[PDB]
Amino acid sequence: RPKILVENEIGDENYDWSHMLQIGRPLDGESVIQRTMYLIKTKQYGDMVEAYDHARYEFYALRMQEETEQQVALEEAEMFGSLFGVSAIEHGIQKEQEVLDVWEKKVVEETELMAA
């Protein structure tokens, strides 16, 4: 999952780690960890490990929800006559194809060299 490291105003943010989903921040392992730290501070889970597990379990549900959202959005798009010119797998195949073509010509030349 790509990570942007270019900071927006660090002073402007104000995250209540009662929950994971903050607005300016995305959902990631960081958010989990912040939640664990919050739990530790508040002493809901006195143990660190238990708090971590809890945060992980909160994350998982959110991730599953995110996963379902995208798939159903795709389904909807398919139903209502949306048209996607290049799918991700198709793109990948195309990318592989150029490399393979490059390899083939080179490989033939190498075989010829070996023969001679």
């Binding site: 994971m20 909160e58 159903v72």
Partner: protein
Amino acid sequence: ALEHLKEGAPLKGLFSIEGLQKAWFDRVKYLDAKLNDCTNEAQQKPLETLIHENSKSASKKHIVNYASSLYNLKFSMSSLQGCIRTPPEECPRLGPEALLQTPDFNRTISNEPLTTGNERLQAALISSFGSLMEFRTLLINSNLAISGDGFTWLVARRQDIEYDKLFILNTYNAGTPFNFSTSGVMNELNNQYTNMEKQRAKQAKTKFIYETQQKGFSGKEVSYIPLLAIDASPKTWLTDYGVFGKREYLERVWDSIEWKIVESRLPQRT
């Protein structure tokens, strides 16, 4: 049409005295009247049969859509029952904070089939989905995702009326949960288009892809026996729960499912 709900006093769980009416009684009236306007016949008959008759037809399309809309709603409402939670008229409407709340579907479980009998149904669900909690997450999250006019369907894979395996699918606007009625219509249209072009390969490959998508592991086609429907449209939940309380609504619906009906719908296993 239904017995369990009425115009004066709605369900204590889900809807309110006005909000229920907006959701159900008015919608049904709108649909039936529209259907009557479209077709000169006033005989209701079965809705499913009508859909089967008039499917794969652009001229006889609107009527089919209206039949689907009517049927789906009815199916959704049959499943539902009363609940323990307070009415939304008493409670406050959820604000922008509802979006940021973590869902408890992963960790918590409630209102299972086991609590009111329905043991074999529960076992079937478990077999399909791994667990009850996993099934619930699949259902509710899918329903949330629909974001527009649609329905989430618990279904059973028809190969006596035997079934192979339980499943769940979403269907939108006025889409049927039955596969056999609409299976291969797009392929047929493609074939017609190719014939027209000829009269006036890649296309063959696309047709082959369509065919393999459609056809099952053995049988010539496949169909789905619906067991549970859950509506996703703003029409129902905007009145009581506002904009932000879709998830809350779905939770309430889930709490107030009558699983006995679902179990009865579920046929014998192979």
